[PDB]
Amino acid sequence: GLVPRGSHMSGATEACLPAGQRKSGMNINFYQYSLKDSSTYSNAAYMAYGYASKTKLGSVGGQTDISIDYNIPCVSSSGTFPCPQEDSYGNWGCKGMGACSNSQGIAYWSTDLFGFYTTPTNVTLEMTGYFLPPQTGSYTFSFATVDDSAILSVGGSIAFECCAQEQPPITSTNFTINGIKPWDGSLPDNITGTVYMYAGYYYPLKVVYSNAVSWGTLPISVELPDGTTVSDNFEGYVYSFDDDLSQSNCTIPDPSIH
Find all residues with CB under 8 Å of 12, minimum gap 6, and list them.
6, 196, 253, 254, 255, 256
Cβ pair 208, 125 in contact under 8 A: yes
Closer CB to Gd ion, residue 4 or residue 70?
A: 70
CB of 18 to Cl ion, least distance (A): 40
Query: Quick one: what does residue 227 bind among Cl ion, Gd ion, none, with the CB cut-off 5 to 8 Å set by partner type?
Result: Gd ion
Residue 189 touches Gd ion, criterion: CB under 5 A: no
Among residues 27, 32, 59, 157, which is the contact residue for Gd ion, using CB under 5 A? 157
Among residues 20, 22, 45, 65, which is the contact residue for Gd ion, using CB under 5 A? 65
Among residues 4, 90, 227, 248, which is the contact residue for Gd ion, using CB under 5 A? 227
Closer CB to Gd ion, residue 128 or residue 256?
A: 128
Residue 147 touches Gd ion, criterion: CB under 5 A: yes
Query: Quick one: what does residue 82 bind among Cl ion, Gd ion, none, with the CB cut-off 5 to 8 Å set by partner type?
Result: Cl ion
CB of 29 to Gd ion, least distance (A): 12
Residue 73 touches Cl ion, criterion: CB under 5 A: yes
CB of 98 to Cl ion, least distance (A): 5
Q: Which residues bind Gd ion (CB under 5 A)?
A: 65, 67, 69, 112, 147-148, 157, 211, 213, 215, 227, 232, 242
